[PDB]
Amino acid sequence: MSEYSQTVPELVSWARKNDFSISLPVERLAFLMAIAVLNSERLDGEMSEGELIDAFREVCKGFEQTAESVAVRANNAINDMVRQKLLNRFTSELADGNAIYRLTPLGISISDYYIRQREFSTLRLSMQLSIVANELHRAAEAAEEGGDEFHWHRNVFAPLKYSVAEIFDSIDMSQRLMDEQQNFVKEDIAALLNQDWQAAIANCEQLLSETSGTLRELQDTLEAAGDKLQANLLRIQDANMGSGGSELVDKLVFDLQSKLDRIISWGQQAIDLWIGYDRHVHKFIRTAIDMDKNRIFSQRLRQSVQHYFDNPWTLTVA
Amino acid sequence: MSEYSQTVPELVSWARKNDFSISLPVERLAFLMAIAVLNSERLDGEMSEGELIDAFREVCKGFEQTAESVAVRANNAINDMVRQKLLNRFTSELADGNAIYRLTPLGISISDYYIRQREFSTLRLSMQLSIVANELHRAAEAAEEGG
Amino acid sequence: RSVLSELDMMVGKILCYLYLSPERLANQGIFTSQELYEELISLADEGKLMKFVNQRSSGSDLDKQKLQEKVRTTLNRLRRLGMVYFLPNNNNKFTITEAVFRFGADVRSGDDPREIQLRMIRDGEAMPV
DNA sequence: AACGCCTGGTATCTTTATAGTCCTGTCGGG
DNA sequence: CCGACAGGACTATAAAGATACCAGGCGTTT
């Protein structure tokens, strides 16, 4: 069963019928982040209504807002978060009516995107590939040992669905993180070239080399493990075909193979895109540096185009 | 270093200064989900600008909207998603100016919360606990080996 | 008397740098609209310049093609002013002339930009916006 | 016919006003 | 302290208008 059991039109109809929406203003988003932070500092992962109100008061202070009706404003905000599925509320008779609050998977995912400082790591990738390699190897040995539907479900399907698939998703998220990092570096290089292009040449070459080495190191790691992971997926597929199959295991193995191909393909594509940019920046720097030789107008005219909008002027014509 | 290096007042000051916010009405959320579904059916994990516009047209049809300005509305929606950090855009000179799009970790997390039918599996937990037990055991053996 | 548009100035100063560039002198003066466009986006702030084509532009291809068509339009106006000559049989390629140096009137002397600008407006060469 | 320019329309967003909703305060009474 | 009564503030939504952004029409030039 495709993870997304619904076609695009069906999904659109379903979404329209359920009326799902996200609206995160600066103050509410700050309050969510404050709640996420406060929850992370606690031993029980639970927050009382009074503690949430105190957190809202701090946000309001931080926004320099009026102290009037803060208890109401906080209740409105708490009800809005619950109504938006960001917080789960537990009302127990045993708690004398005091409600207990916990953040939902959604409220956490949103708060973590902003607060969690996410940067790409090869050690992490190497570890993840090592674990998945061991999990796939065990699942392949279990598939080759053969067995009943219980053996195939517990020793082959459960590891593939609840362990291998999750690690592949983590690898993909790390790749998507690396993609954001590249776009950030391009913006920094443009800023360095606009401030002082002559002094920025060494810094730009360092940023280009550090990013390139990282992309290549990543790809070398994926390629080394990718062949072993594919061989184990094929061993499982061959063992499944030999033991009369299971459509559930075949579909799951096919999905994992498709993800692995995507994970391997992404690295080569990212390298090609980075190379195009790297060549362009080197060509630009060489053109800026070396082709003006008395070196008189390069600076004189480039700075005028770069900063025109600080003093826009226009010529006159008959 | 605490995963969240900033105290609540510092975070509030920082958030206020960066002016962070998220706006995904039903149509935009549906479009994001449609993009997420379309990306999952592909072999390269990449989407072109024309494919995103076709996806937006289907959402608009599904919302029974006017076919007027759809290419403009789709561009505004695509720019909004990029501006809201949901999509990464790659503009390569090698691609004759054609931009390539990929969903960000954020855009994926949000779409998956709604589309992925997540139900609690005991087997999954048993498996996860097995992997962490092996990873912790290896890390403990490595720590005891010293170095 | 009339004044040129700021987009005309961007294309004018870029055509000026292109004329000077010894790196492209081997072309014997023949340039292509695509090369001009590529040089322009290499130097100016692409996303901030896009604001003039449309107030909502954020890097969409439709907006990038609209920018290219605006450039095609302004370049045709400069051809009428005598600043550039299209090839006899191919309209995607053209040749520069020395008249483009008037776009450098704000920097030909290495002095205070404000004083230069004042001098120019006093002489009737250029107006602000 | 296509490109360039203008005019008006359509979409989007903002502003402005109104009305609601709840809170707060006061007073009186219990 | 409760309960009543109004008044004000705050918040939200509606209404209206403007502004942007494109398209369509029209006019000129290749």
UniProtKB/TrEMBL annotation, chain B:
Quaternary organization: Interacts, and probably forms a ternary complex, with MukE and MukB via its C-terminal region. The complex formation is stimulated by calcium or magnesium. It is required for an interaction between MukE and MukB.
Domain Chromosome partition protein MukF winged-helix intervals: 3-117
Function: Involved in chromosome condensation, segregation and cell cycle progression. May participate in facilitating chromosome segregation by condensation DNA from both sides of a centrally located replisome during cell division. Not required for mini-F plasmid partitioning. Probably acts via its interaction with MukB and MukE. Overexpression results in anucleate cells. It has a calcium binding activity.
Species this protein is from: Photorhabdus thracensis
Assigned protein family: Belongs to the MukF family.
Name of the protein: Chromosome partition protein MukF
Location(s) in or outside the cell: Cytoplasm, Nucleoid
TrEMBL record, chain C:
Family, per entry: Belongs to the MukE family.
UniProt KW Cell cycle keyword: yes
Annotated Gene Ontology cellular component terms: cytoplasm; nucleoid
Protein name: Chromosome partition protein MukE
Subcellular localization: Cytoplasm, Nucleoid
Spans traversing the lipid bilayer: none
One Gene Ontology biological process: cell division
Keyword field contains Zinc: no
UniProt main location, coarse: cytoplasm
UniProt subunit comment: Interacts, and probably forms a ternary complex, with MukF and MukB. The complex formation is stimulated by calcium or magnesium.
Function comment: Involved in chromosome condensation, segregation and cell cycle progression. May participate in facilitating chromosome segregation by condensation DNA from both sides of a centrally located replisome during cell division. Probably acts via its interaction with MukB and MukF.
Source organism: Photorhabdus thracensis
Keywords in alphabetical order: Cell cycle, Cell division, Chromosome partition, Cytoplasm, DNA condensation
